[PDB]
Symmetry: D3
Subunit: 169 residues, 6 copies
């Protein structure tokens, strides 16, 4: 009942699962059609961004493409927001390779993020925080782990989204 | 899947979209069936009431009738509450004429609003706050504006709801 | 669209209606498919636990089986969490007999409740708080009342869930 | 270093100890000059008002006169607010007789409480909530109890404040 | 008992009075030594920044120099934070001329604001929000008003702070 | 103006600096007598406990003895609470050796922690969370680091407190 957006990949729809600041990992279950509590982070950390996925996309891992929506406020689990991809984050975990889109709200939704057009527009401190988060929030979970490969530019991210949409199309 | 209520217009159902205190304009999309983030208020203001609409009603502007639910607590976006209309607010914006119902929770739901039976039961300060809100929260948005015409009594509001229901029913 | 869980009664699904700390009694309406606001507690109290029901179960009172999910954080109304029943609470109200399951999140979801395996693992103070809550939160409501009969063990609770599931299944 | 106010008893200073909605009983210790945590309510209730005392007053019980500040927002422990007494609440506990002033913020501070000039201006539901609170929040505490005698008018309250001030000054 | 800071004007101490997001105007009273509640904004707006003053400074208006601390989190009323002035805001109100320093936390305190070195580093949207705030938050107050003259650079701000300190020193 | 408590080391006073859940490192400055914002954690973590120190104590590092107050609620910065030491945490950082007391509120203050009498009463998950926190929250800060040596029993903790008090007295 949801699509990636008429203007993909320049602007895409993101269904929020985890509000920013949260320390509870919610996960949207398309089958049952509900937001399920996967697990309460075993570490004393919290999501430094709103987390969700672009509906109508499919990655090589069989899952829709994830998005790290950067704002200074939280959104409600299950709400949809239109974002602008500004980059991509490459990483490897116990399951294998993975990539997550990094985005800010589209300009008309929140004009205070208009100057952030690419991953290099983010303060170094913010990038370090995000990287550190992914590399330590699952540590205390038996057999899990994450290692950040590197970052990608907005153009790169836009491509990943294109393929992800094509796979389902 | 929702109706205005078996006791309309004395008591009607309101599907909440924007929780009170919020500064993010959420919008319920009946098509996709989700709560979408329209935009984050460009001004440093926040909704002085829970905002939503009466399902199963239609106004001359092609949209369902809006309601300003007055309480001293927030409700969750997407939840339904039974209210008592106590008035109506008339205004004009860039799109034209508009009217919004003003209501408090029905007595059984919250007996602390039982003595507020009509618009004149609200403190002058509260009315001024609401009027000022509508006249300034969109200011910074290009080409958008709002001007309050005046207020209407509960009886007036009950009528508006009656017509709005007929149009559909 | 929801079930009690593949591992019932050892681990069951609970659809949350009232987040912990809340003083607003939300109700999930399966018909309309929405979370409605039943009422705002007339007393100055708040739910000392996340409240919800096990989907796909039926009790002698014609309603699904309730669950008191104990955690130190709130969950979003309408979200599903997997719990471990650790006990049962027996009570009688104006409508008659009633029983409510007491549970903690399943181990993988929140390993900090792993030591709590049965009702006697809960501090006496916590039990007194819960009992006192049920016996006083409806007091100010005309003709309503609740009296706690006693507590049951985890095994007892697991049985109640078994029957409740069979009735429907 | 604090006084009851230049306009006592029409408008008095109230040093807030317990923010509204709180379930932790804070107490201001004039000796040490700090806000101490007396106890965390044993019951699942919370203060339906901001609680504090009028500095520079003394009652027959050797303690300053208490005030129940009614607002729809919380104030910070240790902050001072100017209120308008609108009534008085008479009660008896394990220690003996007691009276607590009921007030709303002074008009200039919050004009939305301007219509509430006396205790009878408060909704019945609000009064019942407050009374029920005092009669049940200490129940689970060994040997403590409270019974509400009745209410007093604003004029009555203004007198109590006058005496309480004279005793000290 | 507080000073502007050993590194003034490059880094100065700011005693916070109003936490960001607040809609209650708190005021630090050096005499009584407490945080008072001046009033509750009559408009439905809230401070888009943490507000406070640099202790040990004096302006031509007889008051210490104000500071608009920009962060994406709130600080506790009465707490001190070390900031970096990045600009100054010139305005006119019913009382006359006025200037307010604009600052971000010093780098060690919060390295995510390190890239904001001057007023022109702030998004246009953020500046518009702040300006709009000052020009409308007092509107509903009888006889009050504010008009923004313009902005000043960090160097300008550093000078204002220098004078303000010498007046007292 | 504050002491460790008449019943030290069985029950001691703890002046709270950092409320639980916080991600801003507040620090009490006895000189200026204010709560200062040291820094906003560079990592996406938050204090899994209320943090503070026992007034009137001195450790070999020239600083008062720290305490990790464990509760499921936050306390206000600058407030004092009476705790029961249940253990001690040994660690080493860039500055050298360090020990921090672990405590729960005294029984009368919060009877729901009465069953936790020693460090081994805490769930393994909780201990892992605390250890992981200390070992990663300063990581992104240049030249800082922390390594946990091990835990100590309540008796051990009581001794450390005794010496720390003796040094000052
Ligand atoms: Mg993936
Ligand atoms: Mg309309
Ligand atoms: Mg039942
Ligand atoms: Mg008394
Ligand atoms: Mg000035
Ligand atoms: Mg130390």
């Amino acid at each position: 009942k949801l699509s990636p957006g008429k203007n993909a990949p320049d602007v895409v729809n993101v269904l929020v699962e985890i509000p920013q600041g949260s320390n509870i990992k919610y996960e949207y279950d398309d089958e049952e059609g509900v937001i399920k509590v996967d697990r309460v982070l075993y570490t004393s950390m919290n999501y430094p961004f709103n987390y969700g996925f672009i509906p109508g996309t499919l990655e090589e891992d069989g899952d829709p493409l994830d998005v790290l929506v950067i704002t200074n406020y939280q959104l409600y689990p299950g709400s949809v927001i239109e974002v602008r991809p500004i980059g991509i984050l490459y990483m490897k975990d116990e399951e294998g390779e993975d990539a997550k889109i990094v985005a800010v709200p589209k300009d008309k939704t929140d004009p205070s993020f208009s100057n952030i057009k690419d991953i290099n527009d983010l303060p170094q401190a913010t990038k370090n925080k995000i990287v550190h988060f992914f590399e330590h929030y699952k540590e205390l979970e038996p057999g899990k782990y994450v290692k950040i490969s590197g970052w990608g530019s907005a153009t790169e991210a836009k491509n990943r989204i294109q393929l992800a949409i094509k796979r389902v199309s």
